[PDB]
Amino acid sequence: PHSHPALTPEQKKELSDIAHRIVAPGKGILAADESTGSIAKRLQSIGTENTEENRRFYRQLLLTADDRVNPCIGGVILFHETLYQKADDGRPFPQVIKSKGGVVGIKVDKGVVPLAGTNGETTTQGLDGLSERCAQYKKDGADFAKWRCVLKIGEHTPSALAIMENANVLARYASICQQNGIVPIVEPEILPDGDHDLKRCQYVTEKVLAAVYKALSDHHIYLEGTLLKPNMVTPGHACTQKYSHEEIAMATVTALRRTVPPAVTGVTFLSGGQSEEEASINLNAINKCPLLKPWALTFSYGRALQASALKAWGGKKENLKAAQEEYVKRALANSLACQGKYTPSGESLFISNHAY
C-alpha cells in the first residue's frame, strides 16, 4: 500500500515524449524486425539466398526510401542484427532512421515457448539479461522496444493460465524497459485463426486487455510511457458471416474503450494476414468510428507495408527504386488511414456455399 517510485519525473517525461513522438498525428510504425528465421522465408519467397548482405540491402532499401515517408513513419522496429548494420554510405541504420524523423525500436523477446498442460498455448521468453540489453540498446540509439505474446481463440483457449502468464510476462518486460529509458510496446496478439465470429473475438480481446492492464498496474507500469499493439477485432479467418469495415471498426474501438485506460499514449495495430489494402481500409474505418477515442489509433505494420516492396525488389539491385516506391505508397496510404483520411477506389471463400 506504500509507494516506492519506480520512475522519477525526468524518467517519466522522457518515456512519455518518446511514446508521443512515435504515434504523432499521421505517423505509424514500420515493423522490419523479422528474426533471422522469419526474414529467411521472406527472401526465400522471392528466390533470394538468405545472406547478411541481402538482409542488409533489403533493410537499407526500406530505411532509405525518399523523404515522402518521413511524416508517415514515426518509428521503425529492428531486429538485433540490423541495429548494428550500416547503409552503403557507411551511416549506421539507426542514424538513417533518426535523420528521417523516426524513432528507433528494437525487438527484445526471444520467441514463444509452449505452456505445458495447455492445448497448444504459449507464453514468450526473453527476460533473461533484458535490463543489460535495454541499457546497451538505449546507448546504441534505440528508444522503444517490442515484445510479442501470442494467444489463440479455440474450444478451450485462451485459458486462464495463458491469459494470466502472458499478461504477467508482458508486465515484467515493460517494467525492465522503463527502467532503462525504453518505451515498451505491449503486444498481446490474439490470432484470427478459427471460425469464431466477430463477437467472440471482441469478447476474448476485452478479457485479454483487461488482464494485461491489471498486470501492468500490479507491476507499477507508467502507461503514458507505453504503447499497445493489439489485434484489430475481426471474425476468424474461417468465419462464414460477412461484416463491413464499419462493423470491424465498431467492435475494435468498443473493445478498446472498455479496457485501455486513457493514459495509454497510443495503439499501434498489427495487421496479421490482412492484405496491404485491407489493413489500410480497416485502420481508416477505425479512425472514422463515431465513438470517442482518447488515444492515437495508428499502425505497426510489417507485411502490410512490405509485401509488394519485397516482390518488386526480387533480390535485383536495379529494382531498388521500384521496390521503394511500393513501400512509399503503403506508407502514404496508412498515414492517411491513421487520420481517417484514406479513401481508395473500390477473397471470401469462407463466405461462399463452399464453406457449407
Binding site: 515493423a31 523479422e34 522469419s38 522465408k41 521472406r42 496478439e189 496479421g272 494476414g273 510489417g302 507485411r303
Partner: peptide, 4 residues
C-alpha cells in the same frame, strides 16, 4: 511469423 507475424506475416501470415
Amino acid at each position: 511469423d507475424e506475416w501470415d
